[PDB]
Amino acid sequence: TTLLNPYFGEFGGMYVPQILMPALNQLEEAFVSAQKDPEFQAQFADLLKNYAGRPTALTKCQNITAGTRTTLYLKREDLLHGGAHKTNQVLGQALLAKRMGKSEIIAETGAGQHGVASALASALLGLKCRIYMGAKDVERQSPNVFRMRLMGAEVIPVHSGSATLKDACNEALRDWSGSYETAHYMLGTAAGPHPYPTIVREFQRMIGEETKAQILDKEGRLPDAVIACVGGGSNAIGMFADFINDTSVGLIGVEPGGHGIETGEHGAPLKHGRVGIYFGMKAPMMQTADGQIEESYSISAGLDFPSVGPQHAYLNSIGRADYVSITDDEALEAFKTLCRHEGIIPALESSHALAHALKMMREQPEKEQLLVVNLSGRGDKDIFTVHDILKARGEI
C-alpha cells in the first residue's frame, strides 16, 4: 500500500526485491510529510537561495537568433553551485535524509557528476557520504573522483558485472537494503522505483517555476516550447512540470542520438528502445532481443542512463510531450556555437537541447517562436573531449 500512485499510466512502479519495500515506503511517507511541512520548505528554500544561488538567470540569445523570427532564452542551471541542475535535488534529498533521522548517504555515479553533487550536499549538511562508481569510470574520471574525495566522500570502486553505471546502481541498492535504518540512498535522476521519480521532479520543479515567472516578466506570455536534454529525465521534468497544465506550451525532450539512431550506437531508449522492467521500474530501456540490459552510448557520459524516467514515457504516450534525438556531431556544433556567439561553454548534455532548438530555428527561420532551452550545466568538464574530437578529424 502506498500514499501516492507509483505509476504514470502503465510506466513506473516499485519493482524491487521485497526486502527494499520498507525503505521505499519510509521514504515516500517522509516525502509526503515534508511537502506539507512549512519548516522543511523554508529550510530547502534557504539552501537553494543562499548556498546554491537560486534563482538562476534566464539569458536571451540575440546573437544566435539574429535574422530569424526565433527568440531564444537559456535557463541558466550552468550557474547553479556545482555547475549543473543536479544540485537542486541532492539538497532536498539530503534534507529528507535528516528528516528520517539518517546520518549517512549512499549514491551511485556513472562518470562522477552525481557523485560530486551527492558529495557536496552531504558535506554541507554534515552527512557521511559513500559513493559507488564503476571501476572503469573511476579510472577515466580522475577529476570527479578527486572532487568527491576532497569533499570527504568515500569513493568505492565497483568491480562487479561490467564495472560501470549499472553495477554502481546495483551496489548502491545492495548496500541500502542492509543499511537503510541509518543511510539514505540519494538516487541521481527522476527514474528508479517510486517514490524517486516523483521526489526528484518535485525537487527540480523550481527550474520551470522560475522560467515561467521570468518569461512572463520579460515577454508577457508563456513560451511556445521548452526544450531539455534527457539522460534519465531530471532536468527535463524539472523544466516541464510547471508547464504540464499550460497545454499551449510544447515540452520537447532530447535524447542522445550518439553516432546516429540507425547505427544502434545511441542512448535514445524512450523512442528507440523497448519497454522492460529494470532499475525498479517499467520503462523503455536499451536491451537485447532476449531482454539483457544494455548500455546507452553518447559523446556525453552524463546522458548514458540506459532507460528513462517513467513520467517521460507517460507524457510521450499521451502526446503531451514530444521526444527527439540529437547526434554527437549536432551536439558538438551547438557547443561550438554557444561558446563563440554568447561566451557560454555549455555541458555536452545541455548542448543536445540547444542543438535541437538551433534546428527548430534554422529549418524554419521565418516561423515566429519563443523558445527556452534548459541549459542544465556548464561545459568546462567537456573541453578535453571536445578538443580531442576536433583535433582527431583535423577540424582544429
Binding site: I19, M21, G276, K282, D290
Partner: protein, 268 residues
Amino acid sequence: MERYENLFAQLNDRREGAFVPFVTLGDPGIEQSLKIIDTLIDAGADALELGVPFSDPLADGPTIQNANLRAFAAGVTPAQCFEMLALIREKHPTIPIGLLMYANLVFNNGIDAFYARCEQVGVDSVLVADVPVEESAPFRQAALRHNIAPIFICPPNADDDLLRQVASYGRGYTYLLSRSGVTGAENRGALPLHHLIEKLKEYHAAPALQGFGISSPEQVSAAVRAGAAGAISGSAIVKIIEKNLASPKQMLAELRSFVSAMKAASRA
C-alpha cells in the same frame, strides 16, 4: 502438476526436511552444468532452485554474481536455459524444479508466454526476485494459469499484513529469509524464525523453506527443528564450482559429498 505437494507429503510421512540446492543454469558451461545438476539429484537433493543468467542480478551476492558471469562467458542464453530445463525434467520426473528469475526476463516476450514456456518444459515454480507482493498480480495470475507456483520471499521482519499476503499469494513453498541484514545491528528488526514459521502455518501458507546463508549441516537441522519444511543452499554449493573450475571431476565429487552431508542433516 502437484510436485511440491507430493514431495512435502512424502517428506512429512518420513518426518524429514527438504534440502534444496540453488545453482545458476549453464555455470560453468551447459554440459558441465547438466552434470552438476544430475550430481546434486543423485546426492539427495529433494528439489532444485535454478537461476537464469541475467545481465544485472541485483539480488545476488558475490558468489552467485561470479556464477552469472561464468555462464555469460560460456554464451548461455535464456533460450538455452529452457532447453536445459526440458532435458532435466525428462531425466527426473518428480523432483520439484523452481526458477529464480528477474522481472525483465519474464516480461520480455510477454508474461503469459513466459509461464507457458515454463509449463511446457515442466518447471514447478518461479520466484521473480524484483517483483514484491505489492506488484505481483500479473505474475502470479500467469503462473497459476500455467500450473506454475509463484514463490514469494517472506522477510524475517515481515509485518502481519505482509505475512497474510505471502500466505495468500504464494504456492509450492514460502521462501523464508534467514536474515533481514548481515550485521547483528542490521538484523535487529528480524523476529524469531520459529514465531514466523508458526504464523505462516496459522495462515495456511505454503510450507516454509528457509534460505540465505545456509552453508552447514547444523543449519539444515536447525531449520527443521524451528518448524520449517526444509532449507535452501546456493552460495555454499556454487563456491564448490568456483573453487574447482580447473578440475571438473573433483568439482562433481565435492558437490556430491557436500549435498549428501546437507541432506543427511534433514533426516529423522
